[PDB]
Every structure is written in C-alpha cells, then in structure tokens.
Symmetry: D2
Subunit: 317 residues, 4 copies
C-alpha cells in the first residue's frame, strides 16, 4: 500500500479547528484499507486567518516530504475559506510529480451527514493513486477531482462548494479515480518557481471595483506595503475613469496593477480591451479570480518585477 502523509492545518474538517490530526485519522478507520497513513500537525487555524508565514511553512514541509523516498503522496487537511489559495500556491511552488491533495469539509464531523469523512478518504485514495502523478495539486471534495489551479469556493453552505469554470477533471468513487480532462497550464514539475528558493513573499493586496468606487483602498494598500494590487474589477477587469489616474500614479511608483474581476463563473479578462494595458504598463489576470491572482502575483514577484514577464506568467500558469 502507498505511504501517504496527512498534514493538518485546521478548518471545519477538524471542528469539534479543534481536533488533532490523529483524531481525524482515527475517525476514518477505512484509510488503513487503502494506504499506510501518518499524520503531522503543521498548524491549527481557521483558514480565513492564514498568513503568508503559514503558507511558506506549509510549502516548505510539503517539499521536505516530497523529497522523501518514504512518501508516495501528500494530503493536506485545510479550512475551506482559503483552501483555493493554498492549493494554487502549492501548484506553483512544489517541483514534484508526487500527488498533493488539499481537502476540507463544509460541515464538522459532529454534524448530521458530515462530509469530511468521505472527503478525507477520497483525498487519501487520490494521493495513493498512480493516476494522480504529474497532475498537479488536486482538490477532492463532492466526489470530484478538481484542479488546484482554478477550483474556487463558489457555493456557500452546500457540500458542492468547490467549482471550476473549466470543469472537474475527474471523479473519485468507491476509492477509484476516473479522469476526463488533463491540466493545460504550467504546474509543479514544469513550474519555473520553487519553494526551495523562496524565503520570503512580496506583499500583495486586493481592492474591489463597484459603482462609485474611489481610489482610497488602492492608495492606502500601497502606502501600507503592497508591491502589487489586484484590481477586482466589474466586468472585463474594468476600471472607473475616476480611479484610472490613481492607478497610473501607482504604477509609476512601482506598484504592479493586475486587472482581475468579480465575474467568476466563466470567461476571462482580455489585455487591452477595457483599458490600455500596454500604454499603462498594467497586467491582466486572465481567468484567475482576485485571490488566485494575488497568489500568482506574489509567487511571480519572488522572481521578476518585469510587467511583460508577469503577463507571460499570467498567460502560462
């Protein structure tokens, strides 16, 4: 049987973030049928409260485990609120074909019809499966195999919370994986980024666009350290004429201006359509939602501050 390590970080999957990883494992006795499992407690947090120091710590531990010939696959138990951020971060920085699965639950294990037991079983099943090798980071909730790149928490309350605009890649049913699509975007072994060479993360913040929005949050975020601002625009990353001149001033001051959107079910932000990105030296976030865009920007800016290069990266990952 495969050797799978479970790194626990908290979340509702661990709600009485109360239960330790040994308790979570003990709650799924059937894990022993499909893998040789062992658990570590990396942290014990509510994921809405995650820090960049937590991401790096988790990232570095995943890398140490992926380097061990004693580990075949890795599962991370996590809160659902920022699961999608972690999953994408690991997809960019972990230079391994070994399976990495991120899993949570919408209901604590004490609730009626709690979803974590089966989610956790499926995460270990997928992490133990030869078919998962080289697929990038995966998320295994709602019987699905979702790409960590572009899966997002799209539905509140319901167990079907996690969706991608580009569909699930597969399903996991009675411990068996069934694949229907492969990834197209750069990940894990084919990434130019590596956690082994990342000691610090640049500060990236996010500001919302809406009717009657001002330049206030943009300026204030930059003044308090943002090296890049993700603009969560209306429509195709649209920017109000009131706010354009502030963003131009920010960019000249050296803040990357990355146009994302709050239009998150499909489509993407097209360069030079709604704003003159060439003239302004701005970047579009392609299909990536604001919080995903922030992750890619921050990892990218460990390597380059060149806005052309950042655009390439937003078109490749």
């Amino acid at each position: 049987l495969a050797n799978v390590v479970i790194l626990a970080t908290g979340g509702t999957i661990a709600g009485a973030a109360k239960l330790g990883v040994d308790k979570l494992i003990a709650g799924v006795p059937e894990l022993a049928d499909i893998a040789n499992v062992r658990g570590e407690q990396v942290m014990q947090i509510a994921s809405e409260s995650i820090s960049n120091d937590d991401l790096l710590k988790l990232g570095k531990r995943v890398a140490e485990l992926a380097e061990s010939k004693d580990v075949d696959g890795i599962v991370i138990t996590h809160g659902t609120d920022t699961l999608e951020e972690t999953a994408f971060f690991l997809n960019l920085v972990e230079k391994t074909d070994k399976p990495i699965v991120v899993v949570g639950s919408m209901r604590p294990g004490t609730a009626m019809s709690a979803d974590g037991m089966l989610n956790l079983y499926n995460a270990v099943a997928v992490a133990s499966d030869k078919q998962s090798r080289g697929k990038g980071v995966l998320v295994t909730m709602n019987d699905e195999i979702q790409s960590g790149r572009d899966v997002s928490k799209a539905v509140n309350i319901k167990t079907e919370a996690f969706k991608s605009a580009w569909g699930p890649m597969g399903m996991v049913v009675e411990g068996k994986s069934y694949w229907f699509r492969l990834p197209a975007k750069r990940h894990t072994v084919n990434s130019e980024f590596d956690i082994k060479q990342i000691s610090s993360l640049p500060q990236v913040d996010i500001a919302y666009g809406y009717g009657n929005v001002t330049d206030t949050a943009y300026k204030a975020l930059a003044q308090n350290g943002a090296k890049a601002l993700i603009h969560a625009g209306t429509g195709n990353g649209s920017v109000s004429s009131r706010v354009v001149p502030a963003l131009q001033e920010l960019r000249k001051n050296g803040v990357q201006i990355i146009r994302s959107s709050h239009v998150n079910q499909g489509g993407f932000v097209l360069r030079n359509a709604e704003q003159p990105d060439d003239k302004n030296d701005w970047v579009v976030a392609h299909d990536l939602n604001p919080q995903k865009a922030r992750i890619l920007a921050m990892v990218a800016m460990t390597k380059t501050q060149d806005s052309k290069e950042l655009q390439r990266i937003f078109w490749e990952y």
Copy 2:
C-alpha cells in the same frame, strides 16, 4: 392598442461604436414598431464601470417621473453591463410603480459579428410592453431570459450568457412572447418602504475584500475617507480574519455599519452568527447578496435607518 414604452439610454457597450445616441439605438431595431410605440430619451452617456452616485440618482429620479406619467406604460433602460446589476437592484428598491421597468445591455457592440444588442433591446421592449411584467419588479432581459433585477449578476465574462442568478431565471422571452416559471419572493417596487421621491442623496458605502494575509488597512482607510458602512467581501460564509476583527469592532463603535457579504457568489448565503458573533458586535449579514448588491441595499436602507437590527431585517426582506 400598442403599449407606450420609453427607452432611457445611459451608455454602455450596447451603444458602442457609450457613443451612439438613443435615436440611433431605436433606428437599429426597426421591428420595435411592431411591438410598441417607442420613444427615446438620453439620460446620460457613460461607461457603467464609471457610474457615480450622482448619476444613479439622476436616473432613479427620471424613471420615477416617467412612471408617474399617463403616456408611459413601461420603461426600458439601456445600460453598460459592468454595473447593470447595481442599477437594476437600486431601481427595484426605490421605484414605487407597478409599471414594467427593464434594464438591458449587450456584451458586444452593434458593429460586431453576431452582436447581441438588437435582440436584447427588442426583448426588453417586448417585456416592458407585456401585461405579465406588471408588478414583477425590475427585470433584466438578456440571453432570451427574464431575470430578476434583485439578484441577477454579471457572472460570466465575454459570453452573451453573462448574467446569472443563484435562484435561476424567472422566465424567458422568445419571438416577442414572455414565458414565466417563477415569481419574486422578496420585497420590491410597490411593496418597498423606500421611495426615490424622498431620496435625493445617498450615504457613502464602500467594499473591502477578504483573502489570505489580509490586513485592516482598506477598512480603516475607507472609513477615514467617509464610509458610513463597510461591505466585507469575505471568504466563505462572510468569514473575517482574526487580524481584521479588532478594527471592525473599533469602526462599529465609531458608528460605521459592518455588513458581512462574501466572494462566494454562485449559491448559498451568509448566515447570521455563524462565522462571527454578529449579535455581540452589532454587525449585519448580507444574506445571499453579493458585495456590490449589498452596498446598493445598505446605501438605500441607511437613508431611513441607522439601527443595525432594522438593517438586518431589510437584508432579510429585500
């Protein structure tokens, strides 16, 4: 006898070469005369991402004047898609008329291959002219659908199916005919407590985003710049970072309303007292309303009340 419909033009891609005037929009759809007696007015000519509160009030006031007119049976507003959902919701809250009001845009300009605006505008006029539209609240007629102005949102970029509701389309409009499948459940228009005839200004309300490693910076700055309420676009069920909570408590104590929405917009809602102790902190949840929708309801509600209990009632009824 054909319905008298007024088209209030505001700009948007439907008018792209916000370049074409209302008379040219109407001339572009000669089949309109088969379904209604149409006349056009240019209220403004903007890209909707650049709309101001002043612009939004001008539109609201003018809709009310035309609604009160005996020569008007329905009203169509042509509008940019970017903030169409915000305008539609605003009108839903403040226009105390049973006359149909339809807001419509397009994802492509009329110059484009397979442009969507012609049929969208025809469908808008058809719905505004239909007896079945009376008393249904503000409607949005894109993609052959009849969508509620309350909770339709621009959810898909690029594609003509851009506008979606978590609660589904209420109907369809096909070869000029309306087909209904659901009715509204939330308060609107004639059943609303709000009235644009009493509203000539709007309180400043702003939106701050939640994500990993977020700080209190944006919340503080928006309040320092005049925000009377903050919409929190949280992760998950309106969840708030432990590093933000203290600032939100400070701001609420200074009189700023704290309203928990989310960026989890395909379904579900934010539940009071679940992720945060709303009762203890005297905060409000935005129920199913996305952050921009939440901001429009908060700003309208705060013309009438600063009581967070009443605000919450309003978030549960509209």
Copy 3:
C-alpha cells in the same frame, strides 16, 4: 409542534429498500426536536420499478392524511430514480395547502458521509414550517427547497443530484427555511385535477429521438396500448422525416403525440417551430422533460382528449 407523517416507499434512503419507516425515524433522533412524527410503510420498492398503481396508492393515502385534522405536513421518503415523477404527480393531483415534501438520498445510511439523515431532518423541518403552506410539493435535498414540478435528477453519484432549470426556490439550513422565489405554475389547491377522482391512469409511453432513428418504438408502444406517446426528441422536440408519417398515422388513430426533448438543462419546446403542430394536431411539452411530460399527459388525459386542451394544460402546469 407540527404533526408530520412520514410515508415511506423505499429507495436508497432506506438501503443497506431494506429499512422500515420506524428505523428511519429512530435513525434521526433530532426529529423529535422539530415535529411530532409518525411513520407508515406505504410500500418498499426501488423507484426505478415504480408503477402507476404505486403512484395512485401513494396519492390516495396522501389525500386521506391531508384531509385529517391531526396532520399538519406530510413527508414521503422515496428512491431518487423516479422521485421527480412522483413529486410532479402529487403536485398535480393533491388539492391541499398542507406541506408535502418528497425526499431521498444518494447514499445509504451505512455509507461514509451519508446524506439521508440531514435530508430527512430537512424534509420534516420544511413539512412543519408555515412558510411551506401553499407552495406546492417540495423536494429537500442538498440543503435546497426545490419545486416538485420541475426538479429533476440531473447529476449521478453526487449529493447535488437534483436540479431545476428555473433554480431552487429556497434553502433549508439548521432547520430554518429561506425563500427566494415562488412557484408560477398551477399546483395543488389551484389544480383542476384531483386524486380523489382518479381510479387508474391512462397508459403513456416514451420514445427516444437520435440519428438514424426509425418509427419502430412508436408503433410498437402504441400497438401495446399507449394512449399518448412522449417524443423525447433531439433539439427543440425535432422529429426525423422518417418518423413524422408514423406519428401522423398514430394521431389520426387517436394517440396523442407530445413533443418533449432530451435537451434538459434549460429552454423549452416551442409550438409550431420544429413541426407543424397545429396541422398535425400534436402538442408540445413546453419545458417539461420526457418523464415529467408523461406524468402530466397521464393526468391531463383523465379529463380531456382535446389536443387544444392538452396544450393549454402543458402551458399552465
């Protein structure tokens, strides 16, 4: 507390259709917090094997319970395969404002993260809520309140199985009901149909449309006693040139011809668009899928043989 009766019919919700109704109720001890529950076993079937006599027996028993002063609400536990058919049938024939909720589960109770406990709790909650009165028949799976009219089993395996083209009407969360839409179509107390008058249903059958289809299934079904045929056409209820003449002959000879489709995520079939329905005296099924269209056709034909009236009905219900 509301007096709720649970009428068990079988399904995976009763699997290990094995468990009796008293064991189902005992499996959710929390029901006693929210209603006074009593259970009856109406039948014990796999819903894929349901018959028209099963529908009548169930319907009649629901009508008897709705006429009782000691009953406030009724929950029917059911297999998921033909849940949508039963739900719709009851929507058409039960002339009561009392809540009627139909519920199943995708997983049996012995399974990891089984969905039946919470679905049954929610069903009782909804059946006990004054907000459910007058709403028609409801389906309460996946934390949703779905209309019995047009909810369908659209997704296999997953707990989100049940979807409507026109959206959920509400949600049920920690026992509380939250409404967002109301029904538009005729149902229950405002239906012209009543189960008290119906002794046996007309035989109606369904034939599929696809490339290189012939008239064989249509003729055989009619030969073996179909009084209407639901055409599950491609597209907008489209009919092959090789099939049209047979359907003209079958209509001439008194068989109703109802054009539905296997295009079931959205839209509707439009009269006179793909076929000359007025000339052929055929009927379109509007938005209704083939199995739902069958239910409506059977009920409708208990009142009328006039295709114009049948079309009215397909446009109102």
Copy 4:
C-alpha cells in the same frame, strides 16, 4: 500565401437556414467576409439536411469526405457546418474514426442568419480560426459555439433556444475570442490519431437503437427494436442506468440471444453510470456507458461493434473513449 488551408464541408442546419438547410456553402462563406483575413477557405456541399433526419449513410459519407481531405497535403484544417440537433453525434463519430492530428471543427447556430442577433456568423468565423490554429492540432474533434472550444467527445445540446446550447459535464476546454484560442484543459480520452478505429476500414455500421426508462416502463420498446434489427440496445435509464424489474428479464433474454445491452441514463449534467452498482453487469454480460449520454453511447457502440462483439472488450472501449 501563408494562411492555413481550411475546407468547409456543409451539411445543412439552422446555420444555413432562413426565417433550415436552405443556403449553400458559398452563401455561408460570403456572409463572413472576414474569413479571408484568417484562412484560405474553400467549400463543399456534402449534403443539405435538417440534422434530426440524419442517417448512418450520411455519417459514413461525411466521414469519408473528412478522411480524404485530412489525407490531402493541401488541407490544414476542416470545418463541418451542421444542424445543432445531432451535431454532438457527428462530432463524436468523427472523433472516433478520423485518424488525423489535423484540426476538425463541427459548428452550428441556434438562429438563422436572417434573425436578429444571429449567432452563426461569429460561430463560423471562430470555427475557421480554430481550424487554422496550431494549438488545435492533436486535440481531437472540436465544437466552437458560444465563444467556447468544446470537446466533440462529450459536448451535448443541453439548452434549448439559447446560444449557450452546447455544454459538457467536464467543462469547456478553451475559448476563442477575437480569433485567438485560449486553452485551459486537454482531452484525457482516446481520440483521432490514438483511436483503434478508422473510417478507412468501415463500410458499414451495425444497427443500434435507444430505449427510455421511466415509471411503469415495459419491455415493449426493447423487444420491438431488437426484432427490427438492433444489434445493441442503449438503455436510457433513470438514475445510475437503473432498470425496472419489469424490463430486466427481457434484457437478459435479448443478451442471451446476441444483443448487446448498454446501460446509459437520462441524468446528463454530471456523474457516470457505474458498473455493477444498479445491475449485476458481470453476471448478465452487460455493458455500462460510463459518462456518455444515450445518443453518444449509441455512436460509440456502433463504431466499436465494427471491430468486436465481446462485451468485455466493449466495456474496455466505453472506459477508454
């Protein structure tokens, strides 16, 4: 001139309608003057039909035309204009039998070109743009409606009336915007150059028919369809390809008498039919159709049964394609 050579094989449909199957291919091309900017476009009228009336003879004819053009050094990509009703069936058929890496795009429209805001102009432009793009090579058969790049394998007509008609349970693979292609997923199932099937070796298709499952269903349709020549039956079941107890005996007798029994469903937005779950497939020597809808399962079975009548081999095929 460096522009890609793209041939449009017209077959009919609403894309060729007036307010179906009225306009010839020259009028289609002439209606998109911009095609000249992106490819060297030539046409051929293969047929002129409403696609709900397509035959197996029509499929073979089309397949063989596609094959010859794919073999031509003077053709870079192929576009088929088609009625939307059975577009999904043709697109999957070609994905199974065309042993080429050259782009093949199937396209239709929901509205005729005479209509307000007609969809066909842009759909055809996008089909040509995709058929001309190097990124399309090796991707299998594509469908390019609603600004999407969909897999011909598992895209289906799922929404009536609206221009977003075509959907896949597994998502769009890409989008096409201002003539440019943007990819987000790749195929996982066998297709085209990696298919074991080849139209060059198929002169005949075995007869396959489809019957529906629903309450109070009987064995009548299954028996009549087999009596009138069906070599396989696709069972369009409720739920997880579930079969009524009233029908099971009939399917066992048909199977014993040489008729393949293939369990699909009318549950088409997600999931799949799992072997041995609702019916003892092993014991009965039946096949499950996996995620494939009934009409898609019929195409696969038809093609598969040109090579094998071993139900174990047919199940392998339903799990690989």
